[PDB]
Structure formats: structure tokens, C-alpha cells
Ligand binder design. Sequence first.
Ligand SMILES: [Fe+3]
Length: 345
Amino acid sequence: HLKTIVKKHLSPENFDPTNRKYWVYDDHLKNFVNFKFTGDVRPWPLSKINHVPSHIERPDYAISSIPESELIYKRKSDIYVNNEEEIQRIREACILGRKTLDYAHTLVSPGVTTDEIDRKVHEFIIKNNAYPSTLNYYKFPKSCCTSVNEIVCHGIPDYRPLKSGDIINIDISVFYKGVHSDLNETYFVGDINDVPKEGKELVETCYFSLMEAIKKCKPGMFYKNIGTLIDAYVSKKNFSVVRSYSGHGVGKLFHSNPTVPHFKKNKAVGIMKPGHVFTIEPMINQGHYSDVLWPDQWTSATSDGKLSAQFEHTLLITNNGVEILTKRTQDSPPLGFDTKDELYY
Ligand SMILES: [Fe+3]
């Protein structure tokens, strides 16, 4: 009974995203039966969880789903100061995160499913003796997040094929030598001319909002000032800043202090000091700032169904400035606009 329905109605080649009849038989789609979507993106069925070989070191949530070292009590003012040996380890995880993102980028093309991309990303991380940080983190079922068009963040890779003209953020994190790396980029799928013009401007504005904020980071600067910089930059182009998600400390813990909002007049706690490692990851919207959480408990979409774009780096505060651990390299595929690396390195 169950097997036939999956085969006939919930497979990559025959799933109908505009018919909810068989959704009740799929553990992902059943949450959506009464849901009113904000845009054109629909969820598709997921594939079965991908295996992790036994020799790979796992983070503390891999089995139980509960990130216990993150739940250990800390003051909101407690921000971890990495030593040289820890920094080197993070640098190396970030190098691998970059390699993994650059590899995922090469897979993006019309017709390719996000699930295909996730599986190949998973395989690449495993091949490199690392663990995909997202896998089973609060039961997140995949090894990266893929957020197309109006999807703000945490999109779950599924059987939906990419269309020429879509924009897709691919969000990568890897756990390697005891530490995490976190980065992400938004890509144009297929013919750049199929992307809505506002979408090209959106993705590019978001990118520079991020790089311009990073350029100001140094010891003594308030973490709350990041949001001041980002919000001002994107407001000039009449785009808005998502409020529901923030940058975070990263390193020994997947997510730690400080919390880093990307909007102005925020109450972020902390000043930047040498040895601090954290992310800035602004999600910027074409229209209204507001997002709705999907009934899968993970996928966020813009409330108006307009486009959203994100970029993310993992950063290290140095004695006199910042270093961008997840920097692009000569092996990084193009973003479709001049990234003006000369301004930042
Ligand atoms: Fe992050």
C-alpha cells in the first residue's frame, strides 16, 4: 500500500507539486496539507538519510540530535577566545568549507534537484573525512541547506528541479578536526538573463553589504554595529533585512555567542576581541522584511513571496582587524558580477 503510492506519486519523476492528495503519505509533505504558501516554491519529497562512515569524527548531536555543548550554561557576555592551535584548526575547516561550497556551486544547473546537490555535497564532505554539521542538528535531515527564490533560509534539499532564472543559496557547514565552518553564497541558475532584474541587484547588493561590513570589523567594535552597517547599505537600494535569523559565534560549537543581527538598532551584546570567530550572514529581501516559518519547522519564506538572498562568511578578529577564513579562492566559480576582491584583500 505505502510502497506503491511512493513509487507512483512521490518519486522524482512523477511527483505533482500542485496536488496535495498524496502528501499525507509522506513524512515531509504531510505537514503542508493545510498550509497557504507565500510564493511559487513548493516542497517536494525528500530522499532517505545519507550514510556517514564510522571512522569520521562526529559532533555531539550526531546520534541524539541535541547539541549538548551548545546548551552548557554561558553568560550572554561570554564570548570564546580561540588560541593559535584552535584558530589553525578553524582555518583548516574553513578551507574545506570553501572547497565544498565551490564544488556545490559547479553542480548548479537547470533541471538538477537540490537533493542531487545535497547528496553530492554529502559525499564530498565524507570523502574529506569530515561531518556535515547540519545533519541531525535538531533532526535536520540533510547535509546542507538549499534556499531557492523566496526561501529565506534553511530550505531542505528535495526532489524539486532547479529552473533557469532561479536564485539558490547553498549553505554549507563542515565539522573537521573538532571545529565547525559556516559559509554560503547565492547563485543564478542557468541563463543569467532568465533571472528577474531585481534579483540580480538583490544578490549583488547583499554580497557587498556583507563585504562592506566585514571590512570595518576590528578589536573594540561593537557586534551591534554590524547590523547598523548592513541595514544602511541595503536600504539605499530599497531592500529589507530579515530579522528572524542572526550570525553567531562558530568554532568548537556550531552556534555560540555572540548573536549578530543584520538590522539596525539591535541589542547585540559584546565587543570584538582578538581570537573571536563568528559569522555574518545577512538575509536580504526584495520586498517586505517579514518571513513565515514552513510547517517542516525549518524552511523560512518571505511573507510576500518576493526574492531573498544571503551570503555568509566565518571571520576571525586579529590583533588589528579581521581575517575572512571562508574567503573565495582562484578555484571559486563566478558569482555573475564583479566581486571587486581588490577592495577587501
Ligand atoms: Fe550560520
